[PDB]
């Protein structure tokens, strides 16, 4: 079994850029999506990509300012956070695998239903202005 793993977090200026790790999927084709929790308020997707086709879905606030990207082997996920605002600051979830056939088509493509079987407890980002 596995526990995904989170790494990259802290408090930045803006107008700053920041890595954010994730580790521990074994997944060859599967969905792996990161989330923001912004503190006292909704979940929200950042990102997403199937490892199958390397298809990519970005939320629209961050589009262009994010960027996801997978280690050789894809045995770790990167999103880079690039010219960071003040509301991205939050707490920062990766999650893997789908449980819901409807999250499966979406992952890459939709914001969607996006229901995962494995979660890992993230990293805080504060964003210094
Ligand atoms: C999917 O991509 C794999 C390599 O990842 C690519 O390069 C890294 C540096 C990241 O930028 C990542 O986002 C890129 O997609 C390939 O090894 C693999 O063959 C690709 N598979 C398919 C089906 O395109």
């Known amino acids: 079994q596995v526990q995904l793993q989170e790494s990259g977090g802290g408090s930045v200026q803006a107008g700053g850029s920041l890595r954010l790790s994730c580790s521990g999927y074994?997944?060859?084709?599967?969905?792996v999506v990161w989330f923001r929790q912004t503190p006292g308020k909704e979940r929200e997707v950042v990102a997403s990509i199937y490892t199958g086709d390397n298809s990519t879905y970005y939320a629209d606030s961050v589009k262009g300012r994010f960027t996801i990207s997978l280690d050789n082997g894809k045995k770790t996920l990167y999103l880079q956070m690039d010219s960071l605002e003040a509301e991205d600051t939050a707490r920062y979830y990766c999650?893997?695998?789908?449980?819901?056939?409807?999250?499966?088509?979406?992952?890459?493509?939709?914001?969607?239903?996006?229901?995962?079987?494995?979660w890992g407890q993230g990293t805080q980002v504060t964003v210094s202005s």
């Open positions: 999650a893997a695998g789908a449980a819901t056939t409807q999250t499966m088509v979406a992952c890459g493509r939709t914001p969607g239903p996006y229901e995962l079987k494995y």
């Open positions: 074994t997944y060859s084709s599967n969905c």
